[PDB]
Amino acid sequence: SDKTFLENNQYTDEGVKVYEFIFGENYISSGGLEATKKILSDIELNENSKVLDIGSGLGGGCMYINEKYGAHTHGIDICSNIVNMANERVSGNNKIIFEANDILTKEFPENNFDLIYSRAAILHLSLENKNKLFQKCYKWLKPTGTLLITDYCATEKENWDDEFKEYVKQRKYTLITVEEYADILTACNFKNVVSKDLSDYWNQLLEVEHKYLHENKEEFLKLFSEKKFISLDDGWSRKIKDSKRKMQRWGYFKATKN
Ligand SMILES: Nc1ncnc2c1ncn2[C@@H]1O[C@H](CSCC[C@H](N)C(=O)O)[C@@H](O)[C@H]1O
Structure with missing residues (x-):
């Protein structure tokens, strides 16, 4: 149901390849590799660390x-077709595992992960399932564990305009405020909860990606169609506009179990 919706619409094989073109190789979220590098800049791990990537893509x-x-x-990742694409990009590495499964029904041993990591995935979850997931993450984290999340947020739903309401509706996103997000983590007894409104940095990432799309339009049209260019071009235009006025926000979340 949730799996079928995502596989058959937003995350078809073609829809993801469109996303990957603008995001960067092996990514389906803003900033691609360069944003990932910055998000993990203060993270300390080694060869013995166990990491969970919710919505690995x-x-x-x-x-x-x-x-x-x-x-x-x-x-x-809940989408089977995406996992199949991801597995074909990694070979000869037994320390990288990709599994097609709903994270809400996936079982992990308590006190297992040093790092639980998720980028632009939890927005697909309802408010009730956000809370259920973060209770599960708290269990899954080692006592010395750390939770790291970047996700789509928004201003209060009361302030949404017609275009943004439609966008959230058709994407079936559940977008809460960065503040409501952090309180969920606090309610789940996460310690040292740090929330960052990185909508300005996100806006910067969008501008680069938008500029890239325009300067590689010819290569894009060879791969896809004009129709998908227009949807991608207008989509980024709206995200740039809305991120600037904080209507659609980019939340950063770091927390520990103890
Ligand atoms: N309930 C769920 N369980 C696991 N993954 C889910 C999920 N709901 C949505 N997702 C995944 O979240 C991903 C969002 S796109 C981002 C993927 C990747 N982390 C990156 O940043 O590059 C989608 O691939 C989707 O499959």
């Missing part, structure tokens, strides 16, 4: 975490 996050730290990366 094409596996770009797991590839980087393993390359940089040498840590065991386990990536969970």
